[PDB]
């Protein structure tokens, strides 16, 4: 079964693997994020409720008043989106917050407040999101791009080689909070442990332990295990668990139980450890040279004399043993400092530490953090207890606590946001374990360690900044609060929240201007994952590995769609199937594989889960049950693509598109292209201009439908049904009854956006693709947008291309084009330019909008009215006048009248004017006022009458259970109608019900039309300051010409060189010329062989189209057409499509065959595409030669090209790098102010920067005079250039050079220091 615009032109779909999961809605990142930001979500997470439950209730410092929260709301926007783009306002909503002030008496923590007050106060306006994922910030339509940043939680990084210049590795460990202070631990090459906070000075790390109220003995209890020396019969024996001897040299005689176990000299092996454990060896008598290097663990004091023997962490000598042995401390605890495993890093750090107690530790930390200003007990304790341990200024989020517990192998995943003692101690323990050998480092490119911020998270963080500023303001006003004479807007202020949130949505590194020239380009700028932005890395610094593709990108980030240039691999684009995790990570679908049978259930994984499992490949042959048909299958285990068994796998890839994105999965035959040319192909495919006549890629991938629907450029039907099709203004859809609400009778009226300006000066235009009285279903398309054709996606157009050298005109990458391409207007794109004119009151009175243009004669008053301004429409070019806008006293008049820029033509399509309340002459301003005034009422009544007509009929329709008397129901016409009684049995109050409808309709229409006139009757609506505001919309129509840039989908760039006549083209023996000749020499080097298979398969597609065009032109009854269409849709191997063609009612075969006579469209999906034998077999169904190559004659000489050439249909696109936006020349005009050199650019009429390497190139020749005029006369020296212009126009090519002006600018800037630079003797 198919929908009704699916039976229009059903694309022949190759593809063997049955898809199990359909493509998700391609704009779901932006929409789900911003729907999380604004939503009334009780339990607080996440959203605006999290912000209000963090900041509220505010209580002042015992001020006995506590403003609390109830509920918030967003009212209607005062401007809908279209008039918002026209006017220039933000597309925002007012944020109505209920606030409840309660005020206490004296001594009321528990006492009832003395008075309350509560109001729906107004703070800020937040910009809402348009239904397509965009904002409208100041008239322009902008997009917030999702950031990719390091997750909160601990990271163990190495930096193995570069420091110390000695090959010794370090190991640092960064505890990155979501909000607050950064804490880093790091080794130094003396093997000492150092802490630093916020990249400040370096403190030896155990001072932070001494800041957490840990004595030295507790620290040594933590990071070291005790070795027990017992004072015994002789020589102070040792408890020895045999694990501690692993891998060391036996220094002494190892004997016990009257038996010599291990002698001196040999290393202790694990067999000797087994001997000591089997022989149960713990207590052995040591020599005195064994204890002479060890370190004591805890303190010991001489008991009788009452003083100290040794401090904790002290190495031992023999006389120290003579001190402690004679006192009476029988147990001696020593620190086991294994040189292999258990290193003495904490102990040597304690030897570096200049502190001894907690208080000096806090004083040293306070002198680190805030220097100069003294370190007192209260100040240092408040500093360190609010560094990490308070809920205000340090907060690992839920993501941070999950990563923090996961990297430390904790059991739980939810905990408190602040740190604790045990967390810092665990980070130090894991860092020490990594130094010892056990456990390993983390990498930063691993996408399980890399979170995504999106629109709702970033706007929520900015909103929380605004709320903490307004709570500091509320704490300010409340302690100065006098009661009861204030209500909660003398306390609260709508200014900082609105200021912060407009600061983010206006001027941020991620709220950026939408690339809008294409439905692809909109939908792939909204799905963008940037590494840049605040808190992330920069373009000009880093690096090599963060610009590189890591094995966790499989199915999360597109490997091949990243922009070439200064930021490669920072501006990654998101994959097709990849959602976003609850915590913000990238989870991608996989198919759960319990046993041999691959189950059709899906299950989402992130990169910290994808490593543990074994995940199959998308294309591994499985037949009729899910069993892998091989006994071994290529999978990947832990980022390593390897071959595993038939029955080990736990997951399989869902579909074979899922590695790449929606820009580079529209490229058919992707798997045959090179990676570089697929990158250049996707990046150019974003840049296509919408042509005037949209044309359906013959070789597509089938993802055109989802991109053209999911990007909101087409008018997808909301509720299904039929159609009324007024359409000149709007599509009117009558709704079928099942999808139709009981009240609100209701028919859907779709607004078509006709010719208007895009963000890239292209033309966004919608055209209805459904006729009158034609069924449509829910989700079906109704109006084709820019670059769409019946709901598909038509960026460029499909043309007949020959691969051959043709007389040098396609030399390096150039492209030689027939005249049949430029006669048919099949690339003639439409550009629209907005031009503003304002008459601001700079000085010496205000400027004026009058045609009475001066000095200039009967060449001003022409394309305008008698009162000034361009008169609309017209064939305006360059140097014309659009808006007469000149002042007197500025015989002292001038010409600021905004004219048409140099080189452009066009037609004035629209003139907008919300000017300084006065623009009118004696009456046009109020003349049109009456026109709109009468317009509103007309439609207002019309619509009511339209429904009235439908209701009147409905009244009679229902008039059967309560008066069906046809001759007794046609009484009053426009007066009343139904007048019958009923009583009970069946409910027929319908008449009464519909009576209310009409009654309310007229009653509401009056009010509806009452406000209409009110709105109509007005000067105009805009902001203040600016006075004369005249915007004129030209529309140039640019065709194609030698110098434009065209390109296919594979990376084959080209500058169209010669626009040949039709005759000189290479025609085949049938007679048709070829349209575009490309060059075969690009194909062996640039290894993008996919354009040839697109060429052959498009040739086969148009072969079927020519065959259907013959069978339908030379008209046959529909049996032969349905037989040939059925053969065309069966065609070859096992596919997914076949068709159910004998259910197309003998007319939907014919409408399909009317829409196929330009070529049968073929879906070649991304990595499961059409094989070559099917291309040959499809070329045999059409009557074309199997090789793909036709013999071609030459249009010049009439004689055959030897060795037959390739002709086919490639889908070639026109990129928006047009040659009459690049052509520029300058002889003489205006310059800058500071310098005497020419200005730069094209919009400024400026000259070429003759840069540094061109000066070196002229020095490389003997061009001393060319360089002398190149930097003195042509550029800078003012006397030289005026003398040169007069010398040229006299006929004397001679320069009088002088000295450059910018060098005298250099002399004054150097001399304006204390520097006396001069110019010496003659």
């Amino acid at each position: 079964v198919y929908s009704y615009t699916e039976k229009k032109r059903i694309r022949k779909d190759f593809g063997k693997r049955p898809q199990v999961l359909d493509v998700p809605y391609l704009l779901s990142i932006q929409l789900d994020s911003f729907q999380k930001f604004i939503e009334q979500d009780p339990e607080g997470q996440y959203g605006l409720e999290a912000a209000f439950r963090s900041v509220f209730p505010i209580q002042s410092y015992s001020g006995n008043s506590e403003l609390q929260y109830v509920s918030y709301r967003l009212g209607e926007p005062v401007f809908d989106v279209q008039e918002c783009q026209i006017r220039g306002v933000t597309y925002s909503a007012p944020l109505r917050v209920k606030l409840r002030l309660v005020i206490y008496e004296r001594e009321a923590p528990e006492g009832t407040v003395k008075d309350i007050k509560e109001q729906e106060v107004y703070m800020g306006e937040i910009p809402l999101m348009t239904d397509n994922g965009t904002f409208v910030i100041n008239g322009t339509e902008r997009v917030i791009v999702s950031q990719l940043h390091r997750s909160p939680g601990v990271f163990f990084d190495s930096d193995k080689g570069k420091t110390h210049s000695s090959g010794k590795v370090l190991y640092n460990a960064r505890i990155i909070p979501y909000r607050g202070s950064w804490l880093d631990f790091e080794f130094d090459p003396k093997d000492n442990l150092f802490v630093r906070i916020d990249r400040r000075r370096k403190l030896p790390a155990t001072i932070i332990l001494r800041a957490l109220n840990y004595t030295t003995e507790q620290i040594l209890d933590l990071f070291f295990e005790k070795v027990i020396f017992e004072i015994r019969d002789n020589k102070l024996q040792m408890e020895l668990v045999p694990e501690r001897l692993r891998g060391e040299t036996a220094s002494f005689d190892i004997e016990a139980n009257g038996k010599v176990y291990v002698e001196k000299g040999r290393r202790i092996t694990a067999r000797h450890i087994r001997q000591l454990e089997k022989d149960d060896v713990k207590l052995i008598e040591v020599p005195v040279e064994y204890i002479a290097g060890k370190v004591v663990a805890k303190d010991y004091i001489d008991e009788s004399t009452g003083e100290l023997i040794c401090a904790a962490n002290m190495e031992l000598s023999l006389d120290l043993l003579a001190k402690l042995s004679q006192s009476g401390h029988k147990r001696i605890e020593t620190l086991f400092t294994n040189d292999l495993d258990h290193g003495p890093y904490i102990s040597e750090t304690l030897r570096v530490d200049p502190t001894n107690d907690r208080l000096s530790a806090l004083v040293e930390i306070y002198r680190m953090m805030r220097p100069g200003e003294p370190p007192t007990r209260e100040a240092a304790e408040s500093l360190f207890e609010n560094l990490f341990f308070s809920e205000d200024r340090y907060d690992l989020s839920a993501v941070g606590r999950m990563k923090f517990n996961r990297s430390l192998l904790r059991e739980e995943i939810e905990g408190s946001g602040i740190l604790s003692k045990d967390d810092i101690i665990d980070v130090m323990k894991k860092l020490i374990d990594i130094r010892n050998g056990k456990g390993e480092v983390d990498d930063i490119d691993h996408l399980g360690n890399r979170r995504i911020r999106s629109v709702g998270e970033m706007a929520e963080n900015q909103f929380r900044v605004g709320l903490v500023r307004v709570e500091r303001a509320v704490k300010e006003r409340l302690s100065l609060g006098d009661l009861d004479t204030l209500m909660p807007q003398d306390m609260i202020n709508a200014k900082p929240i609105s200021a912060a949130v407009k600061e983010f949505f206006g001027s941020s590194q991620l709220s950026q201007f939408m690339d809008q020239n294409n439905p692809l380009s909109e939908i792939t700028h909204k799905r963008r994952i940037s590494a840049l932005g605040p808190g992330g890395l920069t373009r000009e610094r880093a690096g090599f590995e963060v610009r590189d593709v890591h094995p966790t990108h499989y199915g999360r980030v597109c490997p091949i769609e990243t922009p070439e240039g200064p930021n490669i691999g920072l501006i990654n684009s998101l994959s097709v199937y990849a959602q976003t995790n609850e915590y913000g990570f990238l989870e991608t679908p996989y198919r759960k594989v319990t046993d041999g049978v691959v189950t059709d259930e899906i299950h989402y994984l992130s990169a910290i889960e994808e490593g543990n499992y074994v995940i199959a490949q998308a294309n591994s042959n499985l037949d009729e049950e899910g069993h892998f048909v091989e006994d071994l299958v290529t999978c990947r285990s832990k980022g390593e693509s390897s071959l595993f068994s038939r029955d080990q796998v736990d997951y399989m890839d869902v579909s074979t598109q899922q590695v790449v994105s929606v820009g580079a999965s529209l490229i058919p035959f992707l798997e045959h292209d090179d990676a570089n040319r697929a990158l250049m192909g996707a990046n150019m495919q974003r840049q296509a201009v919408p042509t005037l006549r949209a044309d359906k890629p013959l070789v597509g991938t089938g993802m055109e439908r989802a991109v053209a629907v999911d990007s909101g450029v087409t008018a997808v039907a909301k509720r299904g049904g039929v159609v009324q099709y007024v359409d000149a203004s709007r599509i009117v859809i009558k709704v079928n009854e099942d999808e139709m609400y009981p009240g609100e009778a209701g028919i859907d009226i779709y607004n078509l956006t006709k010719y208007t300006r895009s963000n890239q000066n292209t033309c966004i235009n919608q055209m209805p693709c459904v006729s009158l009285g034609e069924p449509v279903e829910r989700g079906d398309v109704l109006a084709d947008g820019p670059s769409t054709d019946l709901g598909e996606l038509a960026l460029g157009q499909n043309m007949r291309v020959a691969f051959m050298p043709w007389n040098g005109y396609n030399f390096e990458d150039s492209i030689l084009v027939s005249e049949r391409v430029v006669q048919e207007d099949r690339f003639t794109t439409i550009h629209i330019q907005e031009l503003a004119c304002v008459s601001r009151d700079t000085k010496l009175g205000p400027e004026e909008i009058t045609a009475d243009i001066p000095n200039v004669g009967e060449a001003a008053l022409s394309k305008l009215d008698e009162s000034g301004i361009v008169y609309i429409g017209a064939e305006v070019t360059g140097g014309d006048i659009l808006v007469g806008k000149v002042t007197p006293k500025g015989s002292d008049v001038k010409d600021s009248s905004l004219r048409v820029p140099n080189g452009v033509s066009g037609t004035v399509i629209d003139v907008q004017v919300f000017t300084r309340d006065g623009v009118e002459k004696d009456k046009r301003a109020l003349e049109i006022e009456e026109m709109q005034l009468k317009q509103a009422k007309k439609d207002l009544s019309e619509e009511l009458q339209i429904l009235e007509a439908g209701l009147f009929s409905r009244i009679r329709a229902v008039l059967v259970a309560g008066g069906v008397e046809a001759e007794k129901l046609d009484k009053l016409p426009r007066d009343r109608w139904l007048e019958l009684g009923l009583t009970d049995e069946e409910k027929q109050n319908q008449l009464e019900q519909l009576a209310e409808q009409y009654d309310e309709l007229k009653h509401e229409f009056e009010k509806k039309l009452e406000a209409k006139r009110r709105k109509i009757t007005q000067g105009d609506d805009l902001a203040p300051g600016v006075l004369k505001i005249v915007k004129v919309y030209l529309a140039v129509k640019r065709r194609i010409q030698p110098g434009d840039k065209m390109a296919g989908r594979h990376g084959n760039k080209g500058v169209i060189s010669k626009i040949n006549p039709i005759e000189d083209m290479p025609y085949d023996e049938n007679g048709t010329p070829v349209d575009i000749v490309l060059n075969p020499l690009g194909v062996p080097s640039r290894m993008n062989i996919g354009q040839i298979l697109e060429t052959h398969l498009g040739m086969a597609a148009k072969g079927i189209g020519d065959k259907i065009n013959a069978m339908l032109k030379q008209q046959q009854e529909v049996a032969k057409l349905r037989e040939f269409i059925q053969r065309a849709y069966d065609l070859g191997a096992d596919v997914r499509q076949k068709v159910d063609l004998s259910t197309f009612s003998d007319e939907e075969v014919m409408r399909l065959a009317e829409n196929l006579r330009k070529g049968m469209p073929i879906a070649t999906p991304v990595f499961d595409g059409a094989k070559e034998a099917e291309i040959k077999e499809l070329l045999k169904l059409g009557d074309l030669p199997t090789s793909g190559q036709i013999r071609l004659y030459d249009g010049r000489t009439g004689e055959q090209f030897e060795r037959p050439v390739t002709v086919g249909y490639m889908y070639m696109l026109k990129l928006n790098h047009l040659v009459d936006d690049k052509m520029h020349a300058r002889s003489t005009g205006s310059y800058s102010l500071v310098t005497q050199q020419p200005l730069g650019g094209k919009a400024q009429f400026g000259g070429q920067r003759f840069g540094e390497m061109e000066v070196w190139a002229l020095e490389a020749y003997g061009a001393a005079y060319t360089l002398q005029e190149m930097l003195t006369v042509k550029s800078d020296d003012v006397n030289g250039r005026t003398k040169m212009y007069k010398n040229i126009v006299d006929g004397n090519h001679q320069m009088e050079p002088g000295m450059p002006e910018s060098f005298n600018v250099l002399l004054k800037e150097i001399r304006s220091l204390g520097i006396n630079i001069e110019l010496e003797d003659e």
Partner: protein
């Protein structure tokens, strides 16, 4: 305001913005002669406004300057003749935007273009590194009269036919024209007109055009080659060469002095480069300019007549490829069955797997290379006989137009063992080429390997440019300022030998450098060359005949000149045949010639004899 990249030195005093300048997108226009370029009419009327004003005021059509500015603002019918009379002999400086060496600013004569795109002669593109994928160039106008003469006499595009970094010609025919020549001068074992005899090259082209022979059909012709064996006198020798039809047609374009054996071979790209080089060394500059143009015209014309496409059938899969892959799969199966039983170590396993996949890759490449280089087997009057193939991708590879062994290898044979960004190789290769489909994992490993290359170029270019900057600012001063420093010291140029076969011969190192003391002939105490002779090609051939050991030659670092380098201790001019002139800045051309290849460079037991002596 002083320091930095955007101070006054680097932004307003060393580089300035410039009037009488323009900029637009380039395109080909192959009808041009190589001293002229196409320049649009709109840019031409804007750049030449004062010359047009002066011309209009000379005729007497107008009076005041205003009238002339209204005339060209309206663009009447008479200013286009004025424009063709200000263009005619007035060169312009075309400039591609990343100018690295001095061949990136060249002066042309304009030919006016209906259009909006600069038409640029194709051979000159290999100097600018200019393809036509959206490039842009700037035009500058030499205003004064000394600058017009410097554009014609120093910077003209006919004057830059040798790269200043070496002796190699920079107007080498790039890509379409070598395919047209390689298809033209070739042969096949049977065609129309096999083994017929022709009375000249004129009727060879007449037999090709009328339709009686083929472009490659072996034939005895009678050609008259002019060998100039006397002292400046050209002696005619006429003979019958067993050659083809295409070699005679290409002999109609060769100038007089070159011998016929320069076209008798198959003419790839190295052969056409040394054809233009021998023409420049024998017949000088003007026949080499006109012969470079005639090469380009006949290459484009017969490449158009060739119809040399590319198809899907042209990439011939080896029939032996699948059995090679199965033998490699059996070998990795044996190694992993030893790995389950623990007989071998892990590093030796990884080394054995990379070794057998390298061996299988080389065998697949040899299978496809035999299957492409001699696939054509056509009979002539009897049994079969083999020849080199006319496969399209093989002529695009063998001609040296575009393609190598590696790229044609990746389109037919397996595309090797791609490496992960860890730097170590991946033990499971990409056994599928591009004609067969890559599946998902293989394309992802390919994207590892290609993203690393794009990141390397886009970060390598900054270090390459900063290296050229440091080099031209250490050089910056050094000007050829004498004619002889009057010394006897100079470095000892030997051929360099690393331990393999002799890498760079002495004729590459002592070509065009003036000897320090007089080289003794290797026999005994003979004055073979004198002590201040420039060693051009004739002297270097008389050095190679006598097998001279090593030459003590004068080097720039031994020059005794205070504040500059004398003219003998530099050497040959390198883009001029003679010695360096008194004046020509050699520090800047040297710094550009070292730093300009900075892009092409990368960024990131006992002795066994080989020969017998």
């Amino acid at each position: 305001m002083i320091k930095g990249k955007q101070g006054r030195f680097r932004q307003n005093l060393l580089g300035k913005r410039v009037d009488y300048s323009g900029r637009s997108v380039i395109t080909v226009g192959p009808y041009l002669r190589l001293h002229q370029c196409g320049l649009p009419k709109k840019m031409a009327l804007e750049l030449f406004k004062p010359f047009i004003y002066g011309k209009l005021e000379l005729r007497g059509l107008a009076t005041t300057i205003k009238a002339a500015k209204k005339m060209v603002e309206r663009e009447e019918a008479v200013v286009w003749d004025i424009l063709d009379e200000v263009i005619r002999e007035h060169p312009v400086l075309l400039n591609r935007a990343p100018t690295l060496h001095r061949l990136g600013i060249q002066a042309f004569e304009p030919v006016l273009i209906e259009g909006k795109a600069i038409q640029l002669h194709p051979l000159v593109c290999a100097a600018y590194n200019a393809d036509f994928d959206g490039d842009q160039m700037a035009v500058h106008v030499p205003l004064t009269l000394e600058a017009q003469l410097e554009a014609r006499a120093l910077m003209m595009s006919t004057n830059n036919i040798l790269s200043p970094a070496n002796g190699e010609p920079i107007i080498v025919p790039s890509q379409d024209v070598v395919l047209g020549l390689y298809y033209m001068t070739r042969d096949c074992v049977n065609a129309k007109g096999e083994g017929m005899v022709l009375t000249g090259p004129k009727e060879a082209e007449r037999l090709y055009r009328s339709g009686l022979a083929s472009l490659h059909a072996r034939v005895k012709v009678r050609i008259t080659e002019y060998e100039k064996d006397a002292n400046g006198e050209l002696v005619a020798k006429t003979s019958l060469k067993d050659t083809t039809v295409g070699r005679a047609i290409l002999w109609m374009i060769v100038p007089k002095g070159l011998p016929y054996s320069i076209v008798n071979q198959a003419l790839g790209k190295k052969a056409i480069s040394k054809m233009l080089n021998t023409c420049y060394r024998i017949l000088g500059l003007k026949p080499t300019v006109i012969f470079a143009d005639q090469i380009m015209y006949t290459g484009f014309a017969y490449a158009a007549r060739s119809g040399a496409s590319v198809g899907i059938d042209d990439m011939v899969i080896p029939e032996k490829k699948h059995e090679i892959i199965s033998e490699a799969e059996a070998e990795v199966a044996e190694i992993q069955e030893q790995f389950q039983s623990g007989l071998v170590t892990a590093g030796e396993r990884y080394n054995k797997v990379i070794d057998i996949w390298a061996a299988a890759n080389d065998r697949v490449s040899k299978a496809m290379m035999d299957n492409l280089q001699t696939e054509t087997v056509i009979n002539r009057d009897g049994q079969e006989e083999k020849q080199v193939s006319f496969n399209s991708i093989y002529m695009m590879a063998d001609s040296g137009a575009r393609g190598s062994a590696a790229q044609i290898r990746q389109l037919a044979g397996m595309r090797g063992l791609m490496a992960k960004p860890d730097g170590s190789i991946i033990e499971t290769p990409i056994t599928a080429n591009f004609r067969e489909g890559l599946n998902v994992l293989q394309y992802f490993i390919s994207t590892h390997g290609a993203r690393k290359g794009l990141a390397d170029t886009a970060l390598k270019t900054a270090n390459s440019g900063y290296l050229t900057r440091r080099l031209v600012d250490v050089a910056q001063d050094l000007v050829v300022t004498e004619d002889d420093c009057g010394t006897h010291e100079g470095i000892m140029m030997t051929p360099v030998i690393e331990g393999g076969d002799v890498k760079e011969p002495l004729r590459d190192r002592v070509l065009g450098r003036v000897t320090a003391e007089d080289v003794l002939k290797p026999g005994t105490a003979d004055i073979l060359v004198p002590r201040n002779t420039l060693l051009h090609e004739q002297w270097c051939d008389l050095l190679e005949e006598n097998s001279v050991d090593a030459v003590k030659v004068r080097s720039v670092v031994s020059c005794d000149t205070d504040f500059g380098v004398c003219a003998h201790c530099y050497g040959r001019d390198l883009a001029r045949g003679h010695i360096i002139n008194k004046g020509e800045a050699i520090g800047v051309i040297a710094a550009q010639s070292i730093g300009e290849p900075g892009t092409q460079l990368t960024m990131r037991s006992s002795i066994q004899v080989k020969n017998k002596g």
